[PDB]
Design a protein around this ligand. Structure first.
Ligand SMILES: O=C(O)/C(O)=C(Cl)\C=C\C(=O)c1ccccc1
Ligand SMILES: O=C(O)/C(O)=C(Cl)\C=C\C(=O)c1ccccc1
Ligand SMILES: O=C(O)/C(O)=C(Cl)\C=C\C(=O)c1ccccc1
Ligand SMILES: O=C(O)/C(O)=C(Cl)\C=C\C(=O)c1ccccc1
Ligand code: NA
Ligand code: NA
Ligand code: NA
Ligand code: NA
Lengths: 283, 283, 283, 283
């Protein structure tokens, strides 16, 4: 599988979206799993999930790696509401356009917020819910905020450079030997290709600060079986939020990887794939 | 499989053990997994693990459910040293007697302490290490100690009764509907059958308080791949010790079950079996 | 000062209170500090605060030790709403009746909930806010709930006895040598004297469970300078809620006493008095 | 009081110190309080404590603001052992030279480590112990390490510049409006004046990593009454270590300031002075 061979586009129409272009990468043909990426500069579906798509397809799933609005090859957008909710509306728009009745959701960071909002707003349209360090869930009981990683994410948005990108990735990943030229070049290309996305994210962040993303109070509504993952060494979203989710969602479990930053599905891809495939099959 | 058809005895000889009788339940014939029980009145291998033995044997493992010294059908003993270490010596004695070169260890509560001590003392004799709420790892950062459950464990040891047993099990288990007459009757029989074990545990506890079991300082020595499990709702061993292990053991992961007391392998048997079998196969 | 010489009664009239009798103990004549007690069987103003009233009066404050509705010598009541809010309405009723424009509030456990609700509902009527282990603030990130102490509080409410009272106090206090016959006899007298209060608390708890007391979402509204106290060894309200308050209230500080249960103002009276008087004088 | 009018030097002789020059600032003449600074580039006694010296002297204490070896105007040194212990030896050397039998100790960050080591090694030479975010106490249960602030401290040591200094101070302090030109210029002067100190700290850090400073296992030996302070927003030493100390030292209390970085005695000077003076007077 390659980004090119799996690349697709679909126009969506959903509350506040009109003929809005969504890019996604699709492979496989069984039960649908939609994977939702984080909010870092240059993020997108393929970039975030290319170590996961193959094994999930091998296990018999139809995998859709979705580009959220204002990311990668999806249309540019300025959001005046919290991104989790607006992103979730876009997932519903995609599913309606593709005639997908229910999807399992996998979401990291901003994508975790997207998945939580989708589960809240459209409970009859979700299967299982998989969350990797979801962002925007209010204060930490231990971590000063904004977190170290978030400071770097904003610096990279406001002053993009290859060096600042490298700096960000060094904090993003636990194992520094994972930061290859290929990784750097790929994220840099996506940043260089879509400068308007960077500008628009910043405008959106001023309109709807991170506090507006906090759906903690509604977590008791979630009936989906939920699998929460965290990197022990995540400098972007606080580990104690894994406990917050575990205590507030009815049917959840929490899996924390040692020696793992803010990109668990990539840093610990083999274990992540096995655990999540097992969860989707058997839970 | 039944307790009767799997029941075996072996005399061990190891530092401080001379012709000492160890009872165990064995099934299967592949790689050896030794499962080690907690320190509650009436505990034993079969009692603690009967929801796990079958699936592990089905997966191709040789499973040994070991009765630790001073429990169930193993010989009575008064220990002047911390139980984790003395128990670990008994595991080594068993393996030597049965010509087992290396074993994967699974241990809950006191059994987790046993497994940690074994990994520390005999690193060339362990495969993988699976820990379910290990006991004796020093103070909690959040929980007043002794924990609620430990108070009840001591009350049951000093004044055994069916009612106190029921009280203990209500705190031990999250889901009260799991407390059947069968469970109560089985633990009660083991308590009634071996009064000397109760008396001896109490004498041992005075000689070597829980503080003596704390091997925290040596956790960096552990090279075994480690899978740590905790019940979110464990009132016997504090959840933050799961983090202590995760931060201090080189290669660990932490899995926490929601709606789960101090007996995770039984309360969440299906998920526990799948996760741990996957870990032994693939990690 | 004695309970008898300071005892006073006042009828209040405030939303849902009509000619409702409130008992309080008053001493001193400077700035008013209203101290609000917890929800344990037999609790009341004098009982909870008799180690604090003298030093506060000596420091120049007018101290009012208030009996909340459905406690001690205040009128009996069944509440269909969360007690923090209803109690706060009663504090406002008291202050209006006594022509008190603004009061500093000190509240432990249920009294902490009362004080938080009062600060939220009547921000122009509060000076400073002092909180000792406030109850009802949602789930803990670490403690299984209901907490050990809360189980005992309900057992004592439903089946009051001197022995169960003693059991409760042993968990309530860290230092067992503080549990004198005088303490036991005093709480027992208050329990024996007002059986209707016990029955009514239980009815109220069914109508408005602890979840309804959770005002976490509104903590950002609090503009009062706030001093939060916790017992390190509090088995009734979880220590991590001290952090929750510290992170969510604009201007707060947190002081945790070692070797201290759920009654910090009594167990560590000298240090508590010095700290809180200093806070009221200088913060 | 000024740095100039209080400046003094004394040669010390103590295990591994021979005719070693220690600079300190002294004022007042009552009971001795020795204040011990952190390990940041350009740190020293006066710099760290100039908002505290006056009020403590006013309260009747003799205050000694000590420059630790390899800082400010004390002699240069390369340490092959953990700095807490070596620093503590230097405090003993100072006290012996000045005929001080017992001192109260106040220590932030590295200075907190110094104070803990002194209490451990010389228990008959300490009065009370005051700790502000002591460094080197092993892993955090929540914070990825090295902490954000520590990364910046090392960057400033290895590549000193005014800009990197400003960057460091922005993370060091919660309230950005506290970062005046005066503060920046003062720390910069101390960095420019003693380049050898920067080089030597780095050499020392390679010889004795932060893990070697961890005296956690010995905290039970401390008999001094202890007051622990933390900034809620400390990005240099993890808040949960405040709990570690509170649970492990016999007689401790913990005070956490909101809106406070890694320099609590300066950021919240008025409250810090009142609390600590009260503690020394009355505890
Ligand atoms: O995976 C990526 O897209 C990425 O590189 C990052 Cl740094 C994602 C961060 C968040 O989405 C985030 C959002 C809100 C709060 C915290 C983190
Ligand atoms: O599984 C059992 O055997 C059992 O019923 C219990 Cl209550 C085990 C508790 C501990 O082993 C334990 C030991 C030290 C500290 C905390 C718990
Ligand atoms: O001080 C007392 O009145 C007393 O003895 C107790 Cl046990 C108070 C407990 C609570 O108010 C409480 C309320 C809600 C949640 C947790 C504790
Ligand atoms: O107050 C200062 O001297 C200063 O500016 C800093 Cl940044 C001190 C940091 C530590 O001493 C430290 C040492 C070990 C671990 C963590 C922090
Ligand atoms: Na490489
Ligand atoms: Na049933
Ligand atoms: Na006594
Ligand atoms: Na200014």
């Amino acid at each position: 599988l390659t980004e090119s061979s799996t690349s697709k586009f679909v126009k969506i129409n959903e509350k506040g979206f009109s003929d809005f272009n969504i890019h996604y990468n699709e492979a496989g043909n069984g039960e649908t799993v939609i994977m939702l990426h984080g909010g870092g500069p240059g993020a997108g579906g393929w970039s975030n999930y290319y170590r996961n798509v193959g094994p999930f397809v091998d296990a018999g799933y139809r995998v859709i790696l979705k580009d959220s609005p204002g990311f990668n090859k999806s249309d540019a957008v300025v959001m005046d509401e919290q991104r989790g909710l607006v992103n979730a509306r876009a997932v519903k728009g995609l599913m309606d356009a593709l005639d997908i009745d229910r999807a399992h959701l996998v979401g990291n960071a901003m994508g975790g917020a997207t998945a939580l909002n989708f589960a809240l707003e459209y409970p009859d349209r979700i299967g299982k819910l998989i969350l990797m360090g979801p962002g925007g869930l209010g204060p930490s009981m231990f971590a000063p905020m904004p977190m170290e990683g978030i400071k770097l994410l904003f610096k990279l948005y406001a002053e993009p450079s290859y060096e600042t990108l490298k700096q960000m990735l060094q904090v993003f990943l636990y194992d520094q030997s994972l930061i290859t030229e290929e990784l750097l070049q790929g994220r840099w290309e996506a940043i260089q290709r879509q400068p308007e996305h960077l500008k628009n994210f910043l405008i959106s962040a001023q309109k709807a600060p991170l506090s507006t993303w906090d759906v903690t109070a509604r977590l008791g509504e979630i009936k989906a079986k939920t699998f929460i993952t965290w990197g022990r060494d995540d400098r972007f979203v606080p580990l104690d939020h894994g406990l917050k989710l575990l205590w507030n969602i009815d049917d959840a479990r929490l899996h924390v990887f040692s020696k793992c930053g803010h990109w668990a599905q990539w840093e610990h891809a083999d274990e992540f794939n096995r655990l999540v495939i097992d969860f989707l099959r058997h839970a």
